[PDB]
């Protein structure tokens, strides 16, 4: 078959598989964007005339936008481009949409306006904006009060009569009348439907919104009936737009012709008249990523490209499928061309030397239709994966998976594939109150490093759009890329499960680690899995942490960091990494209790320590393993993104989970520890790593000799406390004096370990305030307050996270006060941490004996059998580790 046969099947069934001649697909898109030009051209120019096009609508108002732009078009644009009225041709019908009743107004806001209307309602009754309409036409009028109505119109030199029924949902109604006004007081059965048939079978419609800046369900019903839509929150409130008196008829002619619409583009792309200017020494360069928003030129051409992204992710998210909605035929064009780009697509491009292939592609990556029974894969995948993506083998059968949403908001792996332009489908059930979507993918944007030098080498979008689902509804789906499942949910209840049937899906290497349980049976799966070799990606699913992980990188880090042990590399994962941090924070995890020691500090302070509601394990922390990062070679978020592989013994690991595990209550200075108190966690790791391996990883983070320097020296100021803040805490930048500040968030382990006079010990403090902060956030206060230190507060203290608060200072102050019974004052004076009144007050009424300032130095890291204790309490000691 010609790829002109192709073109012409695919545009009804959606079927790309073929189509590779994307110039031909661009010709046609030519001439379907230029004939809805000349429709709408004619039919503005027929209205407008000459005649006034003054109409103000007041802030009391809403906009009222087309959605389909095929068959419906914008009448009244205002002096700041806020569609305030629309016409409609969907489904052949005659209809027109206003953001208010501009009926009532006729004889006085909006007098100016009646000439225009009398045309407009002689095109509605007649087809043609210049026939008069007969004498005593009839109106129905339903929704909006009858008698103005029908005045108004008369207001404009029409002599409309009563109908006297109602045309809305009487047919016989319909039948004989001329025109039908509606307002949102109507009342009917699937009234987007019924005014839809009502258009189509050829009964005018004129709709006015009567609820001013409000929005309203009855409107929104009504407008998608005739292909419109209500505009957002707050209507014209704010703008207040209008069109003035001056408007000339070929401007607003122009406007309406252009709205929505890019015939510049498509000209571009048929021509392929790319722009080989553009002055790239513009672009800048942030920790090895390039970007390029002060390039002339770049940010319009790109903002026009998000225009037509936007246009088809809308129906993306809704789960729509294009080429089963009628009247999309421009956008049908767009996404077939979309497709056929992707057949011919070469990696790596460049922004300076390959000028044709770096912009068309750049087009073509912001439109992709995911939606659908049939479609293309992109043939080359480049970085992102390769054959053993475009060749993994699909379930014909129904797979039945069931799932657990550890938080109320999220997103969570399904635990299988999308194969390169092939279908499957999808439902959930059994989903309670759950909110849901499925997608694919977890890069994020900055991860396709397009404006690097010869670094487009992937699609800039390869996380879907979330598409939305329906309890109990099936959803065909086909990715051009092949991509990992992911069930979004929100409004989900903690520890409550889904069920996802899905066919013609793949299975990609999959690590499901059951919690509790004997995960004998999942690991060796896995490894099978791994060794059949059949994917270019694999996750894993253990505990709150999920990796999204390129199969490549993974190896390379089992072989680098594991000598290929990939049994060891996935039991220190889950213990030395995933455990390990998540036992530190005191959550409540799984056929898994809490250290005897901690046991007892809990039973002893008569705390709840093991309960669900106050301590359960949090939302998951995801992780992308890639060949590119968000920003830099590693990136924070969630997901947060890494390079380099997976290393359960890593630093970045570990450093980077903390940030998720990080609470107000127990940050000094707010902002100040926003990059500390979240490394006790890679500094508990690496304290474990070298007890019971002997690597001695990352020893010299934590600056007890300097932190000292500074403490020594802010000391001798008439204000110690605040000498020493100068010189510690005062400077604002993101890393700042990072290994100093460190070494206070230590000085507890060491005193905790000489309290109960064991070394192994020491981070059990850290543990204790953990569960302590979890109780003084959201333990019922006044049962709980006395049992936490926090008698004397007749409310919870506040949690907030700014660097002039006292509230992460105030509860480090009370808690290890509180934990250790001394009064530890003195000791956060050395440190030049300041603390409220009602603290200090606290404090006092616990009635412990002050513990004088001390000081643990080290002249290592992770090794604490050295460690020298100071008595700071008299005068400052000399550093007592021999230089150099
Ligand atoms: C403060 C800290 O612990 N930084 C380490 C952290 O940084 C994560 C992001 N990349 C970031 O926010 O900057 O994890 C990385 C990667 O795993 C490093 O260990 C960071 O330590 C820093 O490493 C770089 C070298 O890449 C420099 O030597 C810095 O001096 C060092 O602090
Ligand atoms: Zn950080």
Not at 100 to 111: F, I
Not at 172 to 188: E, H, P
Not at 274 to 282: A, L, Q, V
Not at 423 to 437: H, K, M, T, V, W
Request: charged fraction near 20%; glycine fraction near 10%; aromatic fraction near 8%.
């Amino acid at each position: 078959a010609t790829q002109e046969e192709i073109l012409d099947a695919a545009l009804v069934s959606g079927d790309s598989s073929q189509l590779t001649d994307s110039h031909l697909v661009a010709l046609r898109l030519q001439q379907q964007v230029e004939r809805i030009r000349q429709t709408r051209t004619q039919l503005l120019d027929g209205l407008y005339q000459n005649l006034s096009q003054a109409y103000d609508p007041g802030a009391a108002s809403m906009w009222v936008l087309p959605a389909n732009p095929d068959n419906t078009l914008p009448f009244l644009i205002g002096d700041k481009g806020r569609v305030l009225a629309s016409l409609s041709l969907e489904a052949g019908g005659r209809g027109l949409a206003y953001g208010t009743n501009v009926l009532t107004q006729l004889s006085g806001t909006n007098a100016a306006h009646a000439p225009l209307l009398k045309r407009a309602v002689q095109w509605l009754v007649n087809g043609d904006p210049g026939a008069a309409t007969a004498k005593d036409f009839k109106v129905s009028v339903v929704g909006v009060d009858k008698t103005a109505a029908l005045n108004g119109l008369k207001s404009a030199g029409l002599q409309p009569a009563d109908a006297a029924c109602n045309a809305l949902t009487d047919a016989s109604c319909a039948s004989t009348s001329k025109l039908l006004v509606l307002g949102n007081g109507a009342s009917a059965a699937s009234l987007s439907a019924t005014v839809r048939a009502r258009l189509q079978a050829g009964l005018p419609i004129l709709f006015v919104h009567t609820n001013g800046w409000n929005q309203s369900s009855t409107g929104q019903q009504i407008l998608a009936g005739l292909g419109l839509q209500e505009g957002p929150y707050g209507g014209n409130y704010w703008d207040k737009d209008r069109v003035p008196s001056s408007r000339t008829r070929t401007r607003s002619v122009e406007l309406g012709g252009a709205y929505g619409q890019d015939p510049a583009l498509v000209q571009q792309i048929v021509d392929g008249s790319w722009r080989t200017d553009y002055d790239w020494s513009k672009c800048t360069s942030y920790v090895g990523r390039t970007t390029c928003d002060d390039v002339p030129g770049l940010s319009d051409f790109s903002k026009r490209v998000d225009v037509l992204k936007g246009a088809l992710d809308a129906y993306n998210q809704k789960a729509q499928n294009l080429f089963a909605l009628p009247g999309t035929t421009s956008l049908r064009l767009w996404l077939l061309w979309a497709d056929a780009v992707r057949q011919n697509i070469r990696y790596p491009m460049d922004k300076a030397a390959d000028t044709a292939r770096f912009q068309e592609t750049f087009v073509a990556d912001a439109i992709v239709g995911y939606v659908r029974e049939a479609g293309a894969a992109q043939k080359e995948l480049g970085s992102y994966a390769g054959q053993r993506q475009q060749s993994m083998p699909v379930s014909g059968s129904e797979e039945t998976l069931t799932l657990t949403l550890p938080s109320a908001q999220g997103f969570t792996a399904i635990g299988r594939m999308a194969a390169p332009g092939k279908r499957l489908s999808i439902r959930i059930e059994d989903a309670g109150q759950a909110s849901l979507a499925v997608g694919l993918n977890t890069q994020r944007i900055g991860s396709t490093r397009l404006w690097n030098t010869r670094q487009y080498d992937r699609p800039r979008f390869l996380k879907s759009p979330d598409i939305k689902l329906q309890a109990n509804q099936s959803v065909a789906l086909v990715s051009p890329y092949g991509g990992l499942l992911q069930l979004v949910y929100s409004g989900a209840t903690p520890g409550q499960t889904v069920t996802v049937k899905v066919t013609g899906a793949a299975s990609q290497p999959f690590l499901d680690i059951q919690p509790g349980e004997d995960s004998s049976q999942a690991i060796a799966d896995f490894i099978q899995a791994l060794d059949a070799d059949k994917a270019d990606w694999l996750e894993i699913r253990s505990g709150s942490v999920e990796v999204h992980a390129k199969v490549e990188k993974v190896r390379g880090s089992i072989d680098k960091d594991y000598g290929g042990d990939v049994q060891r590399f996935i039991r220190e994962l889950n213990e030395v990494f995933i455990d390990d941090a998540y036992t530190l924070a005191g959550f409540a995890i799984p056929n898994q209790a809490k250290t005897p020691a901690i046991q007892q500090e809990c039973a002893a302070r008569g705390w709840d320590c093991d309960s669900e509601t106050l301590h359960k394990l949090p939302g998951t922390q995801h992780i992308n393993v890639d060949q590119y990062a968000q920003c830099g070679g590693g990136c924070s978020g969630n997901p947060y993104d890494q390079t380099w592989g997976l290393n359960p013994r890593g630093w970045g690991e570990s450093h980077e989970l903390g940030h998720n595990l990080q609470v107000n209550r127990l940050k000094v200075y707010g902002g100040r520890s926003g990059e500390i108190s979240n490394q006790i966690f890679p500094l508990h790791k690496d304290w474990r790593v070298l007890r019971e391996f002997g690597q001695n990883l990352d020893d010299t983070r934590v600056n007890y000799r300097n932190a000292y320097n500074l403490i020594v020296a802010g000391r001798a100021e008439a204000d110690p406390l605040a000498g020493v803040y100068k010189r510690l805490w005062e400077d604002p930048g993101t890393y700042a004096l990072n290994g100093e500040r460190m070494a206070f968030y230590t000085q507890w382990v060491h005193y905790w370990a000489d309290l109960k006079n064991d070394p192994l010990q020491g981070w059990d403090i850290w543990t204790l305030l953990y569960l302590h902060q979890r109780q003084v956030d959201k333990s019922d206060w006044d049962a709980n307050k006395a049992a936490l230190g926090y008698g004397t507060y007749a409310q919870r203290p506040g949690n907030s996270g700014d660097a002039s608060s006292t509230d992460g200072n105030d509860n480090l102050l009370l808690g290890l006060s509180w934990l250790t019974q001394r009064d530890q004052r003195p000791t956060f004076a050395l440190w030049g941490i300041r603390t409220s009144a009602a603290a200090q007050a606290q404090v006092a009424a616990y009635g412990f004996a002050e513990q004088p300032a001390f000081f643990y130095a080290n002249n290592r890291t992770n090794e604490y059998s050295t460690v020298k204790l100071l008595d700071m309490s008299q005068g400052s000691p000399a550093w007592p580790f021999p230089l150099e």
